[PDB]
Amino acid sequence: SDKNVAIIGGGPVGLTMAKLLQQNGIDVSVYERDNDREARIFGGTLDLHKGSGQEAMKKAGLLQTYYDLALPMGVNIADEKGNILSTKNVKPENRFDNPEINRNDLRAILLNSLENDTVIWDRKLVMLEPGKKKWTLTFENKPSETADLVILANGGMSKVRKFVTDTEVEETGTFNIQADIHQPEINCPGFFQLCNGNRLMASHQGNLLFANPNNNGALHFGISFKTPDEWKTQVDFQNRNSVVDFLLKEFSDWDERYKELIHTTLSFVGLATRIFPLEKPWKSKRPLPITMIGDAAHLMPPFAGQGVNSGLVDALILSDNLADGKFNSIEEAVKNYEQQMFIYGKEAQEESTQNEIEMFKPDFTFQ
Ligand SMILES: Cc1cc2nc3c(=O)[nH]c(=O)nc-3n(C[C@H](O)[C@H](O)[C@H](O)COP(=O)(O)OP(=O)(O)OC[C@H]3O[C@@H](n4cnc5c(N)ncnc54)[C@H](O)[C@@H]3O)c2cc1C
Secondary structure (H helix, E strand, O other), X not given: OOOEEEEEOOOHHHHHHHHHHHOOOOEEEEEOOOOOOOOOOOOOOEEOOOOOHHHHHHHOOOHHHHHHHOEOOOEEEEOOOOEEEEEOOOHHHOOOOOOEXXXXXXXXXXXXXXXXXXXXXXXOEEEEEEOOOOEEEEEOOOOOEEEOEEEEOOOOOOOOOOOOOOOOOEEEEEEEEEEEEEOHHHHOHHHHHHHOOOEEEEEEOOEEEEEEEEEOOEEEEEEEEEOOOOOOOOOOOOOHHHHHHXXXXXXXXXXXXXXHHHHHOOOOEEEEEEEOOOOOOOOOOOOOOEEXXXXXXXXXXXXXXXXXXXXXXXXXXXXXXXXXXXXOOHHHHHHHHHHHHHXXXXXXXXXXXXXXXXXXXXXXXXO
């Protein structure tokens, strides 16, 4: 292989691709939107499961490191008042496909395993264009670059897939509001104490709460519901007041301990749940070698655990396919990775869609 591989986007998935290819002596750059490595990453914590994510980390020789930094959480399920089922983590079961790792910590682990200057920061891919033997890649206000194989790994909202497929992101019907409380021990003490160093989830009449009281000392929480008829949007995530107003109304029946969790949030993030659905087969005729992995390839609703792990397998199976050297052409290696990922991906989205229907039914319980 006289060639080089341009990975667009250094997510947890993208950076794993980079690592798995780099250890096999392949030329690779990671082109990342973010301004620099220290950029804060919003979101809850990721956890790598024993069969999938953990297995890719293992192959990058990074499991022990991920274990070091990850923190196993128990789980409390509560009503709109007090505790219904506690699930502390059993000692022989702690490394078990749970260790909750902070999204920045995981990037810090991945980046560290890569050779210096593998990732190029302040690189926003806005355009893609097939040349003679090379993809010319266009980055907003930066010098453009060229690669032999583009791997799209830029998340659920990738604007740059036309060369692989015509399908487009869909809204699934649900919606998520998310925030971080800092010093949750004094800022939302009642709620802090409900969690009792465990993760917490509660559901009441089509609203779901999920909180993790120790994401590197910040309480992160998400509230989730069916997207209201009114919208299609009519709450403004700029004014914290409209969000507060709306949340307090929806959470009227809930305990003071949760309401205090809304009042204290300085700012909220809104998001419609989306799916990049694995319905059609992707494009056959492809001018030069291009493929997609992680959320770019199969964005799917979060609610049932799924997300990064499928995207981490995508890295495991593609790197092997491009490295173990079984196929006669890059073009075969991709097609083979894709044949497989369509199987376990659809399997997953299906389970995901399902659980999303199941839990936003007006009568759901985690029981
Ligand atoms: C509320 C919520 C809760 C979730 N909970 C979980 C969970 O508990 N477990 C789980 O597995 N998943 C969860 N998910 C899904 C999970 O976050 C994703 O599967 C995972 O983060 C996707 O990783 P990725 O590397 O494939 O894409 P991403 O992590 O989104 O990374 C995309 C990278 O691409 C870069 N990028 C974007 N645009 C460009 C561009 N134009 N040019 C260059 N780079 C670009 C971005 O800068 C970013 O660094 C949740 C999602 C939501 C919304």
